[PDB]
Amino acid sequence: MADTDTAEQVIASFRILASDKPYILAEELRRELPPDQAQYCIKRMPAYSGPGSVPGALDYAAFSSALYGESDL
């Protein structure tokens, strides 16, 4: 809605699941995303990357770029 660009859509969509957060927790994807989706994603998004992060945060923004862009080809 307020954003659109394939990669931006996933970030805006993930932000909603993480509850207005620059990162998402593994447990959140398990209860917010099909158990199978949380496990697969929890692997893509590296270990978040913020200043006031938390003990167990993940960055879906890094994973979004890989889904629509992985290695040059």
């Binding site: 859509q9 996933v10 969509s13 993930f14 699941l17 995303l33 893509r44 979004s64 890989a66 889904l67």
Partner: peptide
Amino acid sequence: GKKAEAVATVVAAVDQARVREPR
């Protein structure tokens, strides 16, 4: 309705990368 729509986008995007998974 707003949150469910976001999950559809994340799930749809997740299935895209999964399609690249052999059997």
